[PDB]
Amino acid sequence: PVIKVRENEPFDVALRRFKRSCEKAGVLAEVRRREFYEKPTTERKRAKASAVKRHAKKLARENARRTRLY
Amino acid sequence: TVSMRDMLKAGVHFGHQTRYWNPKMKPFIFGARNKVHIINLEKTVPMFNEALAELNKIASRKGKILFVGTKRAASEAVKDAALSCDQFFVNHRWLGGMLTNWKTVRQSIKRLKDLETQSQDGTFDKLTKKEALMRTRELEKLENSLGGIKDMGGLPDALFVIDADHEHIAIKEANNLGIPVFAIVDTNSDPDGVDFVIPGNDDAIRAVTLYLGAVAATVREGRSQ
């Protein structure tokens, strides 16, 4: 996330850019995840758990939308 | 009686998307154009006629017909049709166990009548404003629900339904009571509960109107007979 302030560029705008860059770089998350060793099962476990939630989110909810609430 | 051209013009042949089809409708489907199912009219019309004949038979013996449609697209029309042949109908939400638990709904009808009498023949007015409002609101509520089956009589000898899957609750009740069923069955629906399936476009308004008008006519004919 190297950044150079453009000419006549306000400081805050640059800073906001930098945060945007870090988010896109996804650095904080990566540091967080690497902070402690995750047993591979735990990793596999999370990944599969995560996927399942996505699918349930995508589908089961979509079907519900078909029916009105009130 | 109803010509096939007429149905096609209405838009009967059109069905639901393929991915929602119910395989029990495979016999009634003709094909799938543009990723949408097409109802084989050749198999439609004779079935429809057969049903119409059956209804006419029922009307002849002074049968009570019940028209069920709550799509809220075809709610107006079904009410209209039922009145045309002065039959009773349920254009709004089918009360669970309306037929099976008739003895209870019988009470609700009775309440409705009283409210109506109070409103009109009473001419009583001088009723507390908030009380009056509640009565009016209640009366409206019942009318919306049971208006069609207030002057229809009692349990129906036959049951015409505009969308099987949508009205499966009604379908089930009729099957438990054994009342013959005449359902418009779209491709997504399940025809098993139905006695006289009518493979057709439940959804489109014109088609629904087409469906009703024939039914209304044959009923009236049966009555005249």
Partner: protein, 70 residues
């Protein structure tokens, strides 16, 4: 109740009060046994009408279909 429930389809009541009172009844295919309900446990309700207005030969017929079965 079933007829006080518009279930037991009761058309005409061709009966002669003071002697015999035979009447047929149908049902909108609800498998409720119109005559059975009209009779009851060993003519439970049948006895009621039997000694109701006076000793009458009340009878119930399981209406089949149309006038031919009538």
């Amino acid at each position: 109740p079933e007829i006080g429930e518009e279930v037991i389809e009761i058309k005409a009541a061709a009966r002669d009060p003071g002697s015999r009172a035979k009447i047929a009844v149908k049902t909108n295919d609800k498998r409720i046994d119109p005559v059975g309900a009209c009779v009851g446990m060993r003519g439970a309700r049948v006895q009621a009408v039997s000694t109701e207005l006076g000793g009458e030969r009340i009878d119930i017929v399981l209406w089949d279909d149309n006038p031919a079965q009538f």
